[PDB]
């Protein structure tokens, strides 16, 4: 479903700065919370 997730793929082609699937999602959550709330 998500083409970065296949062994024949290289994540770096999708994510910059050494992000991960989980680190990018975490980065988006932080964006969401910080810019609104707290």
């Amino acid at each position: 479903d998500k083409p970065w997730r296949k062994p024949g793929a290289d994540l770096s082609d999708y994510f910059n700065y050494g992000f991960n699937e989980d680190t990018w999602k975490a980065y988006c959550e932080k964006q969401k919370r910080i810019r609104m709330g707290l």
Binding site: P3, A9, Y14, F15, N16, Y17, Q31
Partner: protein, 49 residues
């Protein structure tokens, strides 16, 4: 050339993107919240627009 979505940090296409995906380094200090070097910083300040 440099991919705008990749420059933000993530591109849905990847190898199929029409633009180039220059690998860059992110500024941790900007990632936590503040970097005083601003435009002069060596490391990327990705906009989340």
């Amino acid at each position: 050339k440099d991919c705008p979505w990749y420059d933000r940090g993530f591109c849905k296409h990847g190898p199929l993107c029409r633009h180039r995906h220059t690998r860059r380094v992110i500024c941790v200090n900007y990632l936590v919240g503040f970097c005083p070097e601003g435009p002069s910083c060596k490391f990327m300040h990705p906009r989340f627009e």
